[PDB]
Design a protein around this ligand. Structure first.
Ligand SMILES: Nc1nc2c(c(=O)[nH]1)N[C@H]1C(S)=C(S)[C@@H](COP(=O)(O)OP(=O)(O)OC[C@H]3O[C@@H](n4cnc5c(=O)[nH]c(N)nc54)[C@H](O)[C@@H]3O)O[C@H]1N2
Ligand SMILES: Nc1nc2c(c(=O)[nH]1)N[C@H]1C(S)=C(S)[C@@H](COP(=O)(O)OP(=O)(O)OC[C@H]3O[C@@H](n4cnc5c(=O)[nH]c(N)nc54)[C@H](O)[C@@H]3O)O[C@H]1N2
Ligand code: SF4
Ligand code: SF4
Ligand code: SF4
Ligand code: SF4
Ligand code: SF4
Ligand code: SF4
Ligand code: SF4
Ligand code: SF4
Ligand code: SF4
Ligand code: SF4
Ligand code: SF4
Ligand code: SF4
Ligand code: SF4
Ligand code: SF4
Ligand SMILES: [K+]
Ligand SMILES: [K+]
Ligand SMILES: [K+]
Ligand SMILES: [K+]
Ligand SMILES: [K+]
Ligand SMILES: [K+]
Ligand SMILES: [K+]
Ligand SMILES: [K+]
Ligand SMILES: [K+]
Ligand SMILES: [K+]
Ligand SMILES: [K+]
Ligand SMILES: [Mg+2]
Ligand code: NA
Ligand SMILES: [S]
Ligand SMILES: [W+6]
Ligand SMILES: [Zn+2]
Lengths: 430, 335, 130, 80, 190, 104, 130
């Protein structure tokens, strides 16, 4: 039994880098410090399918083939497609993501990541009004007001509160006792149960509440007696708590990206945070989901100039979320083929998008059995980043941390699979 | 020697001597357990009993060991243990050593400000005050000429205290009017003059033309009072006087303390606090004390898991103790 | 009964996706509808009874469970997964992001069974493309 | 007597209790600052295999800080 | 949420002035025999009357002797985008160029190399590690503002900016850079 | 006056009016000496329009006071003089636009 | 489920007692339980299905019908007659008058038949006295 320390967790955007892996032989049999979710990714669950070989669908049955045969058929699909969609990316490393961008240019494809079903509305908002952020260490060391707006970190980023709120920092040496914790959610979540202030607002009315808070912040009267189920007097009191902060942080999630208004909910929250700086130091951090969703948007932006929904059909990059996003291309029946990598749209896209996936060729670069592999024509299994393969990942506030190879696998990495696919698409295009 | 359990309360009785423990008054200081010469008492953890939900009583008294001497009842700074001999409490029997302490308010000096009632950490004070009725703090006459009134409703809307009422209605051919009456409640009116000034037809006549004494009482509950001295210090006219049971010292190691807040929550005298920095980047004392309010009970020290706070006790205020057994027991609590 | 469907994470759905979406524990974590005890009383159901959920966009059978994280009156919660995604609003409002949260749905008790993961995906009728 | 008891089947492995505990924070500067320990240390409890695991129960002072930090009642103070 | 004003104003808690940071880092640079000198973006960027803060900053490391192990550098201070540090007047209403005073200092001193930071008169983007200046720019033009405070290390901000030839401030700013290039006699200092 | 709006059997009339602000219908000056004030709370309780606000608090060893400030909102005050008369320490000194609209 | 039983007149029960308590129309008017449609959905029953009513005082089988006079939530109505009087509270509180209205009862669906008037009265086991 060996203990591998300083391991990086390949699950959520908290990107914990203090994991200890318990290794027996060449198998990760346990962990220390990782939460229930992180531990579940690291260890193998008895009975779960881990594919050892690539597969191709014939009728309703699948046949095992070599990497050469599977990659050749995948390349033929991509090369002959007029509007191929290359989606997922958030659960692989930055080098594999960069090969993806070059392959999308070669195939004249649309390349898009999980941001289109997640913090894509936050990306649309930050492009219009800005992005006032900080790194986790500034929260730990300075924050006296912590807000979780439309996120449930106890269930979705389980060590986030222990690392940023209960932690004793340089100017907040009493930890939890030196901070005012605010949670904004229509449900009484396990995260709201720990708060000093729980604003249990009416669902789909965050935009209305934020309009009232901003008008109040700028010295105007709130037109109505109650907004989003919160009385006028309590809105005024919440604004005073924010104005009296020495250092405030607004963490936010799917509660405002998925609900009525989408990107405009984030837009109004960003503008409130910016204007609060005339009274108190304020910043925000989007609660980025997967451990490397952030890395895709960084890589795609630095290479093409745009973060997601990037269309290379005309050679030059073009960007239009609402037209060039994965759900737009599937629901409007524009995409004629789809390559999925390190994502599960079969499980996580709405029914209307699944109806299109049933009618077009689907390639899945995936290690496990999922709803997407149930809808796939070709399955190509890789070595898993953070366990069996190394590479850069970006934390939710942009901090880059290198993922580690803890054990060995006979499978190819995502980067290797994509490089072989790029060579074959080039051959078919010629 | 038997025992009767009434919820969380404990009674140890022998036949006559009766020791009663009231769980709701116990601060879990541990002094009764420390003083007992036969080690009959076991006190549960201080932090756990204060910060979490527990079905157990704060202390356990072993019937087979207790000899009903009354030392635990005498030392308790919180009136939670009472020994009765033939129906009379030992606090009324001069032969039993008694700790010297007091708390009183001079009613002639008191101005019924209520600051001591707010500050008292055990809610032991009741300050009552009789404010005069609002009508007796204003003087004027007001009347509305109902024939001139056109029922525009502007006085009713603008009145700051809702003293004006109009009997609004939908007109009918039999009653072709928008209202049937208008009235001023003279007990509510504060003679501000707003109504007469807004009236568009000058239907309102309003004219402005020695205040009674504020009486009251004070009461300190002797069972809840712990002689902390917050009332004496907060009083703006020095009407409250307090004498404490013990004298001693508190010592805090700021580096050992990890600011869990247990001692702050445990302290029944509100001695301990976490000061907030006034400006960004300023640093404060991690655990702040003000010994003017301390009674040296030892609950804070007992609750701390890292032993960052210690209590020294230099004197227990009594007249000279005659019994050697009692003198030795009281002396063992000095440190 | 007309209710508002909210969807998202649970720590149990997180443990199940990382253990295996082909295991029984994924059906037990994600093919469920969390409800306040008062709503279960209104419908005449108990924990473990099945519920038919119908929206303008689709239909699904899920298992009722009492919510440990209280809901506002008239709201229900299905964890993210293919059962939830049978019934939420697909439309993106020209943003690329579907409306995964706060959709009006009709819920009634049912004796029909919850579909396992491969059986649920057969509703889409995948046709082999090679 | 009253003592620390874990319910690992209810635990999220969030680490709030590990960090909040003053004994753990005094013994490990990493824990004091919100991280899980990397340096070898003897603390009361840690998150191991995804759940809270009690290692040195004799160091617990039964203060109740960990209990207030857990929203799912997975670590308690009760009659053992 | 604050800033420092001039070279003798400390940040909260740390209690060290900008002058002490500049002087100490110049000494570190020569003790390590680094190939390049310290590379300085002065305090009070973009404010009318900042030319006095700039000249004071230029004198701070002047008594430190260069000692590079590699190359032939013979100057202890490199001052960047000096156009933004050459402003006269007290407000934007009485704003004037003080480039001739800055150029005169560079001509007469042998310890300094500068770069101009020339205005090109375009719609462009500002991005610097000067977090409070970027927030102040956003407060003036009302355009989208990004920020990133990095734990124990630095800060940053990004704001779009339009430098129109027809607007009075950008017109003076263009003229300042031209004066710095043209009034500095020796191009070995530019 | 809005009588026609109420009387109209077909609800065909809209009558609006912009009333003057309360502060423009009273005249006076009011000031609280915060050094003399003992935070008894009698003015705050008796004020008929809730124009007086005290920042009450539970004392702590770091802040051993029952309140940190007292303020009069001059836009709400109606200059009735109740507060000055009830104050037990004489900390308070107190001494004593046409209607527009649309018709449619 | 636990409900509150109210009892009293209906015009149909009036017509039936005056036509004949030995006719089928009396069973159709008085061996019934009126309930709101929401309660019928909670129990999983339809109009015409039988219900077993149990109280501390006795038991009876009656036919469910939708209430035309709406009931408050949790209340049911059995018209006065021997079916209702199997289950209401007999005690008079020393006034001579029993508690015919607002009694807690347990109701569940049943496949057992409603008893006609002579058959229902056999539960008392009359013994001839001459
Ligand atoms: N267990 C688990 N953890 C994960 C994942 C997983 O699949 N499982 N995936 C990861 C990913 S990819 C992401 S993006 C994150 C997301 O993590 P979160 O952002 O926490 O996402 P959710 O749990 O979907 O929703 C958060 C909260 O939004 C609330 N909400 C719903 N409607 C409204 C509204 O109108 N207003 C407001 N204010 N709130 C509302 C919900 O009640 C819910 O508690 O989790 C990551 N971590
Ligand atoms: N109803 C509802 N639906 C939702 C949401 C909701 O709140 N409600 N949330 C939405 C959001 S925010 C998101 S991001 C999505 C969830 O986003 P998805 O990407 O669908 O989430 P996962 O199911 O975690 O899929 C990640 C996949 O990557 C695979 N994988 C892991 N490591 C590696 C690797 O190293 N290489 C490769 N190639 N594969 C790997 C895993 O086996 C897994 O199948 O769900 C969306 N759908
Ligand atoms: S919080 Fe996220 S990154 Fe950290 S251990 Fe848990 S899952 Fe892994
Ligand atoms: S002495 Fe302390 S512990 Fe014992 S009863 Fe009195 S208060 Fe409770
Ligand atoms: S009475 Fe005397 S013997 Fe009995 S518990 Fe109290 S101190 Fe101990
Ligand atoms: S603080 Fe002093 S004046 Fe005020 S009520 Fe108490 S004793 Fe009376
Ligand atoms: S303001 Fe004058 S006219 Fe209008 S309702 Fe009052 S008294 Fe009558
Ligand atoms: S005087 Fe002032 S308080 Fe009295 S009725 Fe007129 S408006 Fe109201
Ligand atoms: S001494 Fe302390 S406990 Fe007793 S009345 Fe005064 S404030 Fe209250
Ligand atoms: S002294 Fe002990 S009990 Fe009090 S806060 Fe510090 S660590 Fe917690
Ligand atoms: S600070 Fe003084 S009064 Fe408070 S608990 Fe400690 S010893 Fe008892
Ligand atoms: S016991 Fe509670 S606080 Fe501790 S790790 Fe488990 S869930 Fe988090
Ligand atoms: S009870 Fe106090 S000492 Fe024991 S583990 Fe919990 S926090 Fe640490
Ligand atoms: S027309 Fe004008 S004044 Fe005449 S009734 Fe209508 S609102 Fe009153
Ligand atoms: S009445 Fe006088 S002393 Fe009392 S609070 Fe008001 S101003 Fe202060
Ligand atoms: S004058 Fe009357 S209205 Fe103004 S503050 Fe004093 S009591 Fe309140
Ligand atoms: K796994
Ligand atoms: K009090
Ligand atoms: K009024
Ligand atoms: K008038
Ligand atoms: K005093
Ligand atoms: K202790
Ligand atoms: K253990
Ligand atoms: K708890
Ligand atoms: K030189
Ligand atoms: K009308
Ligand atoms: K009042
Ligand atoms: Mg910084
Ligand atoms: Na009902
Ligand atoms: S994501
Ligand atoms: W996501
Ligand atoms: Zn610069």
């Amino acid at each position: 039994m060996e203990y591998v320390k300083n391991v990086v967790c390949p699950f959520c955007g908290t990107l914990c880098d203090d994991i200890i892996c318990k290794v027996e032989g060449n198998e990760i049999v346990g962990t220390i410090n990782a939460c229930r979710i992180g531990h579940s990714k690291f260890v193998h669950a008895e009975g779960a399918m881990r594919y050892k070989k690539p597969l191709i669908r014939k009728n309703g049955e699948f046949v095992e083939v070599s990497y050469d045969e599977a990659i050749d058929k995948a390349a033929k699909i991509l090369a002959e497609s007029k509007r191929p969609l290359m989606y997922g990316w958030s659960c692989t490393e930055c080098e594999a993501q960069a090969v993806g961008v070059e392959l999308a240019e070669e195939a004249g494809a649309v390349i898009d990541n999980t941001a289109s079903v997640c913090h894509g509305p936050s990306v649309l908002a930050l492009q219009d009004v800005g992005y006032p952020i900080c790194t986790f260490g500034e929260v730990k060391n300075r924050a006296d007001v912590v807000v979780y707006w439309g996120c449930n970190p106890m269930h979705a980023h389980p060590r986030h509160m222990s690392r940023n709120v209960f932690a004793r920092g340089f100017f907040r040496e009493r930890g939890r006792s030196d901070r005012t914790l605010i949670v904004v959610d229509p449900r009484k979540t396990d995260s709201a149960k720990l708060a000093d202030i729980h604003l249990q607002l009416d669902f789909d009315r965050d935009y209305e509440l934020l309009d009232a808070m901003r008008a109040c912040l700028l010295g105007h009267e709130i037109l109505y007696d109650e907004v989003a189920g919160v009385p006028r007097e309590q809105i005024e009191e919440a604004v005073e708590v924010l104005k009296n902060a020495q250092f405030g942080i607004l963490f936010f999630g799917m509660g405002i990206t998925h609900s009525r208004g989408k990107h405009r909910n984030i837009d109004t929250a960003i503008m409130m945070v910016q204007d609060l700086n005339d009274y108190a130091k304020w910043t925000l951090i989007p609660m980025r989901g997967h451990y490397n969703v952030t890395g895709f948007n960084q890589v795609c932006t630095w290479e093409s100039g745009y973060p997601y929904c990037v269309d290379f059909s005309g050679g030059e990059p073009r960007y239009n979320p609402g037209e060039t996003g994965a759900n737009d291309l599937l629901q409007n029946r524009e995409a004629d083929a789809m390559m999925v990598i390190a994502s599960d749209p079969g499980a996580h896209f709405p029914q209307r998008a699944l109806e299109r996936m049933a009618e077009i060729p689907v390639i899945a670069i995936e290690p496990h059995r999922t709803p997407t592999t149930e809808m796939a024509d070709i399955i190509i299994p890789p070595a898993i980043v953070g366990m069996e393969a190394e590479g850069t990942a970006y934390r939710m506030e942009g901090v880059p941390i290198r993922m580690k190879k803890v054990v060995d696998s006979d499978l190819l990495s995502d980067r290797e699979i994509l490089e072989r696919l790029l060579e074959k698409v080039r051959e078919y295009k010629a | 020697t038997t025992e009767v359990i009434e919820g969380k309360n404990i009674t140890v009785e022998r036949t006559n001597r009766r020791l009663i423990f009231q769980d709701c008054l116990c601060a879990v200081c541990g002094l009764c357990g420390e003083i007992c010469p036969v080690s009959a008492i076991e006190v549960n953890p201080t932090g756990a009993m204060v910060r979490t939900e527990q079905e157990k009583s704060k202390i356990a008294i072993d019937e087979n060991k207790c000899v009903l001497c009354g030392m635990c009842s005498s030392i308790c700074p919180f009136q939670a243990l009472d020994l009765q001999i033939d129906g009379t409490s030992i606090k009324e029997l001069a032969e039993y050593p008694k700790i010297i302490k007091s708390a009183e308010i001079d009613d002639e000096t008191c101005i019924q400000c209520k600051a001591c009632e707010t500050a008292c950490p055990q809610d032991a004070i009741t300050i009552t005050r009789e404010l005069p009725e609002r009508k007796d703090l204003v003087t004027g006459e007001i009347e509305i000429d109902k024939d001139t009134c056109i029922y525009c409703g502007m006085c009713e809307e603008m009145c700051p205290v809702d003293a004006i009422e109009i009997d609004h209605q939908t007109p009918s051919s039999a009653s072709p009017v928008v209202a049937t009456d208008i009235r001023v409640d003279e007990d509510k009116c504060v003679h501000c003059g707003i109504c007469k000034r807004i009236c568009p037809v000058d239907a309102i006549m309003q004219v402005c033309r020695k205040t009674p004494e504020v009486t009251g009482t004070s009461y300190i509950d002797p069972e809840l009072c712990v002689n902390c001295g917050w009332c004496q210090e907060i009083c703006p006219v020095d009407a409250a006087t307090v004498t404490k049971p013990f004298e001693g010292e508190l010592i805090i190691d700021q580096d050992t303390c990890q600011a869990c807040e247990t001692c702050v929550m445990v302290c029944p005298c509100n001695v301990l606090s976490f000061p907030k920095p006034e400006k960004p980047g300023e640093k404060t004392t991690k655990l702040h004390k003000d010994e003017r309010f301390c009674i040296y009970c030892g609950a804070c020290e007992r609750s701390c898991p890292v032993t960052a706070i210690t209590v020294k006790r230099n004197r227990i205020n009594t007249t000279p103790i005659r019994s050697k057994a009692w003198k030795n027991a009281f002396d063992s609590l000095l440190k | 009964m007309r209710v508002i469907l909210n969807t998202g994470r649970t720590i149990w759905q997180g443990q199940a996706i990382e253990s295996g979406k082909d295991l029984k524990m994924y059906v037990d974590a994600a093919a469920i509808i969390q409800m306040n005890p008062e709503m279960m009383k209104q419908l005449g159901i108990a924990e473990g009874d099945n519920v038919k959920v119908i929206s303008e966009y689709g239909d699904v059978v899920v298992k009722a469970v009492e919510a440990k994280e209280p809901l506002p009156e008239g709201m229900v919660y299905i964890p993210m997964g293919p059962w939830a995604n049978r019934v939420i609003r697909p439309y993106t409002d020209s943003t690329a992001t579907p409306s995964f949260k706060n959709i009006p749905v009709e819920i009634i008790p049912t004796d029909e069974e919850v579909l396992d993961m491969p059986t649920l995906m057969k509703v889409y009728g995948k046709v082999g493309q090679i | 007597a009253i003592g620390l008891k874990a319910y690992p089947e209810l635990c999220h492995g969030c680490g709030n209790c590990v960090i909040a505990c003053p004994v753990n924070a005094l013994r490990s500067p990493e824990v004091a600052g919100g991280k899980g320990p990397t340096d070898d240390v003897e603390i009361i409890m840690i998150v191991e295999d995804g759940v809270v695991n009690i290692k040195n129960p004799d160091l617990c002072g039964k203060c109740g800080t960990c209990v207030e930090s857990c929203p799912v009642d997975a670590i308690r103070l009760e009659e053992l | 949420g604050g800033n420092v004003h001039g070279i003798y104003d400390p940040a909260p808690y740390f209690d060290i002035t900008p002058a002490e940071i500049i002087k100490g880092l110049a000494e570190v640079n020569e003790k390590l025999q680094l190939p390049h000198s310290i590379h300085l973006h002065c305090n009070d960027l973009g404010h009318p009357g900042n030319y006095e803060t700039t000249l004071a900053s230029f004198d701070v490391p002047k008594n430190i002797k260069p000692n590079p192990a590699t190359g032939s550098r013979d100057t202890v201070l490199y001052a960047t985008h000096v156009q933004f540090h050459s402003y006269g007047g007290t407000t934007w209403r009485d704003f004037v160029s003080e480039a001739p005073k800055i150029a005169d200092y560079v001509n007469k001193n042998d310890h300094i190399v500068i770069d101009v930071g020339q205005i090109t008169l375009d719609e462009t983007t500002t991005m610097t590690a000067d977090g409070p200046m970027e927030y102040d720019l956003h407060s003036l033009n009302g355009l989208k503002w990004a920020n990133c405070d990095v734990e124990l290390e630095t800060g940053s901000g990004v704001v779009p900016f339009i430098y129109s030839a027809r607007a009075p401030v950008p017109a003076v700013q263009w003229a300042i850079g031209m004066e710095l290039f043209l009034l500095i006699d020796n191009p070995e200092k530019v």
